[PDB]
Design an enzyme around this catalytic site. Sequence first.
Site, PDB file in Angstrom:
ATOM      1  N   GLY A   1      35.115  48.988  51.942  1.00  0.00           N
ATOM      2  CA  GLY A   1      35.338  47.554  51.924  1.00  0.00           C
ATOM      3  C   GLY A   1      34.067  46.730  51.822  1.00  0.00           C
ATOM      4  N   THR A   2      33.151  47.153  50.953  1.00  0.00           N
ATOM      5  CA  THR A   2      31.940  46.401  50.654  1.00  0.00           C
ATOM      6  C   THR A   2      32.175  45.561  49.406  1.00  0.00           C
ATOM      7  OG1 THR A   2      30.813  48.419  51.371  1.00  0.00           O
ATOM      8  CG2 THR A   2      29.433  46.583  50.646  1.00  0.00           C
ATOM      9  N   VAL A   3      31.902  44.259  49.509  1.00  0.00           N
ATOM     10  CA  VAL A   3      32.132  43.358  48.387  1.00  0.00           C
ATOM     11  C   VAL A   3      31.114  43.642  47.292  1.00  0.00           C
ATOM     12  CG1 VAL A   3      31.644  40.987  47.703  1.00  0.00           C
ATOM     13  CG2 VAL A   3      33.431  41.465  49.396  1.00  0.00           C
TER      14      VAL A   3
ATOM     15  N   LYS B   1      36.819  42.356  45.747  1.00  0.00           N
ATOM     16  CA  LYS B   1      37.215  42.435  47.145  1.00  0.00           C
ATOM     17  C   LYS B   1      38.180  43.600  47.326  1.00  0.00           C
ATOM     18  CE  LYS B   1      36.306  37.814  48.410  1.00  0.00           C
ATOM     19  NZ  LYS B   1      36.712  36.427  48.780  1.00  0.00           N
TER      20      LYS B   1
ATOM     21  N   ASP C   1      41.415  25.322  54.985  1.00  0.00           N
ATOM     22  CA  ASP C   1      40.033  25.565  55.379  1.00  0.00           C
ATOM     23  C   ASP C   1      39.119  25.273  54.192  1.00  0.00           C
ATOM     24  OD1 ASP C   1      37.938  28.262  56.532  1.00  0.00           O
ATOM     25  OD2 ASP C   1      38.128  26.235  57.351  1.00  0.00           O
TER      26      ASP C   1
END
Lengths: 244, 262, 56
Positions: free
Chosen positions: B1-3, B18, B116
């Site tokens: 899970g490293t972008v 992602k 957000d």
Amino acid sequence: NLLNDRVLRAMLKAEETCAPSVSYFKCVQKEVLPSMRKIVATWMLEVCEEQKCEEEVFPLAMNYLDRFLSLEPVKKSRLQLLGATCMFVASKMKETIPLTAEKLCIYTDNSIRPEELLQMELLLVNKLKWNLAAMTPHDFIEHFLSKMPEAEENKQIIRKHAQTFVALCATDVKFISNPPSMVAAGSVVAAVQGLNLRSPNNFLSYYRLTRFLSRVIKCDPDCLRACQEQIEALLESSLRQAQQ
Amino acid sequence: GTVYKARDPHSGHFVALKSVRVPNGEEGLPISTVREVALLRRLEAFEHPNVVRLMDVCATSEIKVTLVFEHVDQDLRTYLDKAPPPGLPAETIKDLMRQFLRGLDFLHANCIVHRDLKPENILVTSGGTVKLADFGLAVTLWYRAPEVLLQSTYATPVDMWSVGCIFAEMFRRKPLFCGNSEADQLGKIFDLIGLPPEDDWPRDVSLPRGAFPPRGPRPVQSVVPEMEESGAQLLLEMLTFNPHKRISAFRALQHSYLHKDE
Amino acid sequence: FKPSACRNLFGPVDHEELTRDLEKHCRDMEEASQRKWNFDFQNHKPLEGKYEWQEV
């Protein structure tokens, strides 16, 4: 705003995304035949009716089935598996508590196994490139009924009959090439004629209603009337075949 | 899970990758996963130029779902800090607002609430085109609408308040209200727009009106006098307390202040 | 036991063969996607190709 109806514009644009091919029986499917789709469609509808599924589960599942059959040839013996998987995903997309894999397999008489349904789910979803939020006829019926100046009592009945008509179309080969807007429009006007049980008494006349829907979904009046006539014809067939 | 991040020399296509893992050991893919990703897929049928486009969605057989997104480097904060020393010109600010509002009106029209929005989430191409990102896949309170600060219900008007704050920030180049907690940020807002009356307060809510002293609305030229008269009115219609009276994104695009004059 | 809807439609299924096909269909995609982006998604980390991958 409400005069421009920008939402209706988006819906007609969005319903060009998840459209199956008119002729995948000749071009994609070797073993599957149009008669076999009516069989599995009828089974899938009976399942959604027993499990009291939400209105759109079955027509959405049929949408998934056609799109997949437009992409990959499917063996006869695996057609029922494909249909059980489509109900599975469609249930997730529109139901609060979806159908379980355990119940769908039981509904195949325990022909398929849960792990196979789950693996067929990944094949289904990825073949559709995760394009699962397809415009449903329900979406259009609700939008049309919001523009019809009719008693809520009347709308609930128009809605129920329309929803019934939508299910019958989703079992007929002839309607694969129809976008949900057209199936919804035909269903509505066919419903406002009231199954011939008595004369129509509508605050918005049938004439204005058809011309309104025809202008809105961008088709000629005679074209929507032929769709209404196909659906009512499909109703006559449904009833004749039920009695055997 | 490293972008991950890659550019394509043959077309300049810039991508980000992602990856998110999901549990799924019982009933197959989770409901939220299959709903949220499908909602993203529905959006790109329109290919809206003010929202980052999603490219593909790769799944793996203990399930990993990898989303290939359109990637742009600059965000609005970087763009704003790189402005000319006097600040952004008027016509540039109007152009950024217009695209901002167009993109937000696209999301709202597809029942997506950003909830957000901050200058870190608004992204600007090198060609001066803004694209919205980070939404529909599942801190600083400087931009949250007062109905959110009060734990009350949200709806789409939360994003229009955020637009108001960012609208004024492009002129001030320091943020509008910077509070330390929910209660106090609410206070700094009322020191500008005035303490709302009785029946304009939401009912089921986390802080009563008695938690805040009587305060009148000071002028808006008090805060952004770098801004023309009509732009001041437009800002207030975004910084309106009641969410049902707050301007919509579509109505804002029709305000005279953002009307391109040629 | 079984309601009337519980019904095998089109004969028996070769389960051992079906699972072989199901992964073949599925990894034909996992490789085709890996080929589109030169980024092995199962092992999740880049390859070499048209897209020069970087990091955070």
